[PDB]
Design a protein around this ligand. Structure first.
Ligand SMILES: Nc1nc2c(ncn2[C@@H]2O[C@H](COP(=O)(O)OP(=O)(O)OP(=O)(O)O)[C@@H](O)[C@H]2O)c(=O)[nH]1
Ligand SMILES: Nc1ncnc2c1ncn2[C@@H]1O[C@H](COP(=O)(O)OP(=O)(O)CP(=O)(O)O)[C@@H](O)[C@H]1O
Ligand SMILES: Nc1nc2c(ncn2[C@@H]2O[C@H](COP(=O)(O)OP(=O)(O)O)[C@@H](O)[C@H]2O)c(=O)[nH]1
Ligand SMILES: COc1ccc2c(c1)CCCN2c1nc(Cl)nc2ccoc12
Ligand SMILES: [Ca+2]
Ligand SMILES: [Mg+2]
Ligand SMILES: [Mg+2]
Ligand SMILES: [Mg+2]
Lengths: 54, 332, 437, 428
């Protein structure tokens, strides 16, 4: 029912119509995750090269 | 070949519907968690409507209406009728009711009316004539209960001075056609009615299981519609259609048209139908009152065959075709 | 004025960026060579379109954009396409091998080798800004790059630009157009890792856009080109407030204020109307009431769900074309009396309305017809949670057997990150249910 | 670009390998001279995946031809497209393997393998971004089996982060050179289970049955079996060689087809089934392509798909047809038969379409299925193996080259395990 905060200009207009009222990780830790995962990969690769050496 | 799944095994009605479907040769039954179904006979609690209608290449249908609980849960039915202008406030066909919590004020407004004017003041959850007396029931259970005006002057049958309630099965299809099964049933009370003390159980409340006189005046304590219509003619000079059924059809139409905007699946990506059980009370002046609406109802043993076949004709085969009508269409 | 930088990640993000920037140019009268005759301030300005375009001394209007993909094929099409001259070559960043539909390969293995290069290229646009507002990030949920690399980029932008807002346009996976069987894994992993780093995210379910193209554009099997030109229209009406004169959502901060009362529940539902085929020989032009009504039919939503069975926390109507407030209020008055629109008890039952008099633009020889008036509704409904339920259930079905999990552990992830991501999803679904019943 | 390096080893490896280069060179418009005299540019957009570009803008297959006896290779050079290959990529010994896995893997093959890896290295170092390798070989002989797996082991050691994919021809008493092929196949499968990402199980039993029963051939040759192999090999690599909505590579294929690392043995299928020479004049309708491509009689591994369940499926439709109909027909197949597709991998069937059909057909369909019914093929091999191994029969051929009975016992155990694991997901 109530129309409020009506603002007009050459490009258009805007307004609000009410009907009823109511009732962070760091750079250090990011590097320590990317490197943890590369470690885990290089380990898996090393276990494979060791297996193929057998 | 169409395909369906069964996620509620207690369903007597849909146990009989999957039998009929399988015995067509055109319906395969998958494992209950197989997503590539055409039709879902779903569970009763936490049915996952959000996962319906996202299988490409499949038209999906379900035997329940999301949001229909608003009619089939005692507490919300009372809320729906008092707040919806399509019914509220006082529709001539709903008993004055109030919602109560065991953690009430408006109830005492009309209760203090109904004792100082000597008016009838029996109520229900369960039954008695003093307000505070039944709060022991409310409070030692722990749920939200409804306190409703007890219909002190009902219509009793003879011989027997018995009491009854009428159950009508209504099917609402994917088009929102309202189909009222022509065969209703009168759940009857075998032991006479006595308005003296309201703790004598068997004779005031008419649940089929709460009577296990079981079979005195007719098998299973079930009076089909033919016999009841004959009784009204011989005894009162009127028919079932004029004295009672016009009001039943009016109430069913009013209830279901009220929620149609909130539950219809007309433009939805999945389709709904649902079988309902409307339970009515007829009083001394052949006046029909709505008691409750039941969302997962059972059928009388006789009418299983015919009603379940019409669920297929009207609600399932209309969407998935194969290869007189037992329903009265309530028009709108 | 305050600048916004757009970041397009992976195939879906890049292709949708092409679609949007093509459309932006047609709306602002910027030609493929970057010239803008309407602009009388040569070499600079604090105009509204300067939020999305910088200016060279030679009169060229250049998108404040960067395109990133782990693979050259798609961005190579930008480098040689119609808007070849529009983009500084340092804004087109490609790798050599893609993430193979694997979030862990995109996030950890390959992402760790290009992340610093991208942030230096992002830093070179930010240094051209007098008052950077934040970022708009376009990406798929399902791609390995779209999920994996966006996730890592989003974490870094938080540390390097902690006082700046981040909005997403996210393409939610749909089997009729998907390219990989593991897209549920990627969607859950990237939503979990990004959730605390995004201020407001507009999800677009490819299934919604597909059916809209089939149903209302009579396209039997829509291409990405069909989907993206429709998507670009929705994105354009969401960003128009940033690129034009107006009072509503003028800065990225205001999207969160108007649309997101709680930080985690920051996924508004977009509904757009009318979508009319260009090949239609006869069209009866739809009224303010008719198109406002369409905003409450699920078939016009960017995600299929039923808002009748949820609650609203916020609702904006963004009109373009021949619309005046008198007709909006008239239409709103009718809709509320005939529809199930229920707000949370702790929010006012109101619509924030913005109107731009310029009617929507369409790309010549496109599939969309030119219309007299159009609207995009942004509502934040608990009903959207249905999409999280759908995605999560598919996730649960494979993760119960650990299917494909070995492809991720093999890139350095730990199985536990699957369960952590899934638990956060579980928390997200429980939050929506509390607010919505 | 994302280049594949192809390796054909042994008699069978080189014969199906030659026909493959023959078939795909025709599809891409390259002649035996190595010159491009095609019509459309859609043939060149990813020609680099399998071809290098030498002086005079000539296309040379990135292929290495390997054998321990020079005869079959000389036949290839003598062959129709033989001059298209780079002569330095012919690496031959003179002894031969005698249908003996031990000579290929341990004695005679050891001498030659470093020379092959020198050629492999030269082709790899020229690649912008190598995706991986394709090996063509039989499992029942000596070179393709014993040396081919030894090569795969060494290729993985030097290129551990690249994809290894094989076309492995399984032996069968219906097309059988030697009694020892179950020994050679079992030893090789143990290596394939550990050292490849994707193996197409090409069953000579299936190819013989197709030639006999369906194609109405009474005494089929290796040329009739290899006609079916080239058609299948063309189909399954279409999405690698031509651009499409998918833009696929060997790694994406393994990521999406292999839910568990050891279960990476695919059943290929092809439709319509074509015998050499005689061309079929009626094109199949998309409903028929779809029904035939899932038919057991079109599977190149002699297994019954109704005895297992599909983990994942890939399908390639080639021709000028309606992809609206293709999408409806493929959905039709899974919806009407959902019982044979695992509940627990949603949307596990993926379909691609390519405008260019194979030579001779106006429309075709190629099927790549990762089915648990592939156990039936390994159980067959295990049965034949145990029949001899229980009596240590013919084992002297192998202990004479330094192998121990322990190694046979181990290889048999691993393939039994591979069987059990396939059976574990059939019931889930
Ligand atoms: N709407 C739309 N969706 C797209 C587009 N391109 C890809 N998708 C969807 O994105 C998902 C796959 O992610 P992609 O963007 O293709 O992959 P990517 O981000 O490049 O990452 P990788 O290829 O795995 O390295 C699937 O769900 C596709 O349907 C597009 O242009 N428009
Ligand atoms: N206001 C009322 N006045 C008179 N009788 C009432 C009444 N409310 C309930 N009853 C009586 O109790 C029974 C109806 O109660 P109710 O409908 O809540 O049972 P119920 O929900 O447990 C079983 P169903 O769902 O199958 O009907 C009838 O016997 C009816 O006479
Ligand atoms: N399908 C097919 N199978 C073959 C061909 N040549 C040999 N085989 C099978 O391969 C096995 C013999 O192996 P072969 O390749 O000759 O041994 P190798 O040269 O030492 O590697 C037997 O199972 C043969 O039936 C062929 O050209 N096509
Ligand atoms: C079951 O989900 C799949 C299955 C397969 C694939 C994908 C998903 C994603 C892209 C890679 N991929 C494919 N790769 C190739 Cl080479 N050919 C085909 C043909 C059909 O899909 C193919
Ligand atoms: Ca300017
Ligand atoms: Mg009840
Ligand atoms: Mg990509
Ligand atoms: Mg031989």
């Amino acid at each position: 029912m109530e129309v409020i905060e009506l603002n007009k200009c050459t490009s258009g207009q805007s307004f609000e119509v009410i009907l009823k009222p109511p009732s962070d990780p760091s750079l250090e830790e990011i590097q320590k995750k990317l490197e943890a995962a590369e470690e885990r990969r290089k380990y898996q690769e090393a276990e494979l090269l060791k297996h193929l050496a057998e | 070949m169409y395909t369906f799944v069964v996620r509620d095994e207690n369903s007597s009605v849909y146990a009989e519907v999957s039998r009929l479907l399988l015995a067509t040769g055109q319906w395969k039954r998958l494992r209950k968690d197989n997503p590539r179904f055409n039709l879902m006979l779903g569970e009763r609690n936490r049915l996952p409507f959000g996962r319906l209608g996202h299988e490409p290449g499949l038209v999906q249908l379900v035997n329940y209406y999301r949001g229909a609980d608003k009619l089939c849960r005692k507490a919300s039915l009372v809320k729906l009728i008092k707040t919806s202008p399509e019914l509220s406030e006082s529709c001539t066909w709903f008993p004055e009711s109030y919602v109560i919590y065991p953690t009430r004020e408006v109830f005492l407004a009309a209760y203090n009316r109904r004792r100082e004017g000597r008016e009838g003041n029996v109520w229900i959850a369960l039954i008695s004539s003093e307000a505070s007396e039944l709060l022991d029931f409310i409070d030692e259970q722990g749920q939200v209960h409804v306190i409703q005006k007890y219909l002190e002057k009902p219509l009793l049958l003879e011989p027997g001075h018995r009491k009854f309630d009428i159950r009508s099965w209504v099917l609402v299809d994917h088009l929102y056609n309202i189909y009222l099964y022509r065969e209703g049933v009168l759940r009857t009370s075998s032991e006479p009615y006595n308005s003296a003390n309201f703790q004598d159980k068997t004779c005031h409340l008419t649940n089929h299981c709460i009577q296990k006189n079981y079979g005195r005046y007719e098998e299973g304590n079930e009076m089909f519609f033919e016999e009841f219509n004959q009784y009204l003619m011989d005894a009162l000079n009127t028919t079932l259609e004029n004295s009672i059924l016009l009001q039943i059809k009016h109430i069913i139409r009013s209830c279901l048209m009220c929620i149609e905007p909130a539950i219809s699946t007309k433009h939805l990506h999945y389709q709904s139908f649902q079988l309902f059980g409307f339970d009515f009370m007829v009083d001394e002046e052949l006046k029909v009152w709505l008691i409750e609406v039941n969302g997962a109802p059972a059928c009388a043993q006789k009418l299983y065959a015919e009603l379940c076949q019409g669920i297929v004709d009207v609600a399932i085969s209309s969407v998935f075709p194969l290869a007189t009508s037992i329903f009265i269409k309530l028009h709108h | 004025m305050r600048e916004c930088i757009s970041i397009h990640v992976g195939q879906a993000g890049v292709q949708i960026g092409n679609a949007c920037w093509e459309l932006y140019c047609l709306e602002h009268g910027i030609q493929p060579d970057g010239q803008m005759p309407s602009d009388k301030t040569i070499g600079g300005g604090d105009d509204s379109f300067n939020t999305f375009f910088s200016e060279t001394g030679a009169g060229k209007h250049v998108p404040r954009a960067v395109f990133v993909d782990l693979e050259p094929t798609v961005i190579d099409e930008v480098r040689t396409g119609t808007y070849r001259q529009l983009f500084h070559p340092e804004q087109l960043i490609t790798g050599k091998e893609d993430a193979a539909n694997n979030y862990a390969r995109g996030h950890y293995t390959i992402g760790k080798e290009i992340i610093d290069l991208v942030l230096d290229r992002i830093r070179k646009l930010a240094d051209q800004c007098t008052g950077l507002q934040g970022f708009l990030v376009f990406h798929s949920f399902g791609g390995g790059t779209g999920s994996g690399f966006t996730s890592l980029l989003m974490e870094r932008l938080s540390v390097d630009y902690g006082k700046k807002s981040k909005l997403e346009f996210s393409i939610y996976p749909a089997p009729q157009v998907s390219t990989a069987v593991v897209e549920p894994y990627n969607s859950i992993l990237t939503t979990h890792t990004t959730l605390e780093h995004s201020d407001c995210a507009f999800m677009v379910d490819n299934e919604a856009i597909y059916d809209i193209c089939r149903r209302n554009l009579d396209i039997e099997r829509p291409t990405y080109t069909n989907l993206n030109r429709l998507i670009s229209q929705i994105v354009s009406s969401i960003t128009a407030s940033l690129r034009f004169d107006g009072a509503l959502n003028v800065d990225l901060t205001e999207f969160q204020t108007n649309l997101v009362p709680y930080p985690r529940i920051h996924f508004p539902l977009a509904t757009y109307a009318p979508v009319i085929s260009a090949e239609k020989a006869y069209h009866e032009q739809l009224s303010v009431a008719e198109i406002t009504n369409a905003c409450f039919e699920p078939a016009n939503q960017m995600v299929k769900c039923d808002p009748r069975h949820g609650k609203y926390m916020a609702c904006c109507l963004l009109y373009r074309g021949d619309v005046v407030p008198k007709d909006v209020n008239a239409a709103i008055a009718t809709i509320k009396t005939k529809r199930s629109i229920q707000f949370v008890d702790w929010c006012p039952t109101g619509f924030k309305v913005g109107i731009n008099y310029q009617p929507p633009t369409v790309v010549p020889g496109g599939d969309l017809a030119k219309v007299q008036r159009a609207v995009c509704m942004l509502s934040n409904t608990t009903a959207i949670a249905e999409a999280w339920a759908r995605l999560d259930h598919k996730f649960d079905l494979m993760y119960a057997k650990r299917a494909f999990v070995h492809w991720y552990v093999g890139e350095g992830m730990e199985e536990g990150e699957f369960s952590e991501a899934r638990e956060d999803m579980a928390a997200l679904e429980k939050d929506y249910e509390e607010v919505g019943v | 670009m994302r280049e594949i390096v192809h390796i054909q080893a042994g008699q069978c490896g080189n014969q199906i390998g030659a026909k493959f280069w023959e078939v795909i060179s025709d599809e891409h418009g390259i002649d035996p001279t190595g010159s491009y005299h095609g019509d459309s540019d859609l043939q060149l957009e990813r020609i680099n995946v399998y071809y290098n570009e030498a002086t005079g803008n000539k296309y040379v297959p990135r292929a290495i031809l390997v054998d321990l006896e020079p005869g079959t290779m000389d036949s290839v050079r003598s062959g129709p497209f033989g001059q298209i290959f780079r002569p330095d990529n012919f690496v031959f010994g003179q002894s031969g393997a005698g249908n003996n896995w031990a000579k290929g893997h341990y004695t005679e093959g050891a001498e030659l393998v470093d020379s092959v890896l020198d050629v492999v290295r030269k082709e790899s170092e020229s690649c912008d971004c190598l995706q991986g390798f394709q090996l063509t070989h039989s499992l029942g002989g000596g070179t393709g089996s014993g040396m081919g797996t030894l090569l795969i082991s060494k290729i993985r050691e030097e290129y551990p982060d690249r994809i290894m994919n094989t076309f492995s021809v399984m032996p069968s008493p219906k097309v059988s050179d030697t009694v020892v092929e179950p020994y050679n196949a079992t030893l090789s499968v143990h290596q394939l289970v550990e050292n490849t990402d994707e193996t197409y199980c090409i069953d000579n039993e299936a190819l013989y049955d197709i030639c006999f029963r369906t194609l109405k051939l009474t005494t089929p040759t290796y040329g009739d079996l290899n006609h079916l192999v080239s058609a299948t090999m063309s189909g399954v690599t279409t999405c690698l060689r031509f651009p499409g909505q998918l833009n696929a590579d060997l790694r994406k294929l393994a990521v999406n087809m292999v839910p568990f690392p050891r279960l990476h043995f695919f059943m290929p299928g092809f439709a319509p089934l074509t015998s050499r020479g005689s061309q079929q004049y009626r094109a199949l309708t998309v409903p028929e392509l779809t029904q035939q491509m899932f038919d057991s009689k079109n599977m190149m591994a002699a297994c019954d798909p109704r005895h297992g369940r599909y983990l994942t499926v890939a399908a390639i439709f080639r021709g000028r047809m309606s992809m609206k109909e293709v999408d409806e027909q493929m959905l039709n197949v899974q919806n009407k038969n959902s019982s044979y597709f695992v509940e627990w991998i949603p949307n596990n069937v993926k379909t691609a379409v390519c405008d260019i059909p194979p030579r001779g057909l106006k429309m075709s369909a190629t099927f790549i299925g990762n089915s648990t019914a592939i156990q039936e093929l390994f159980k067959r091999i295990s049965e034949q193996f145990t029949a001899m191994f229980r009596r240590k029969a013919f084992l002297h051929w192998y202990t004479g080259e330094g192998m121990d009975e322990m190694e046979f016992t181990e290889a048999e155990s691993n393939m039994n395990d591979l069987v059990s694991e396939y059976q574990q997901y059939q019931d889930a």
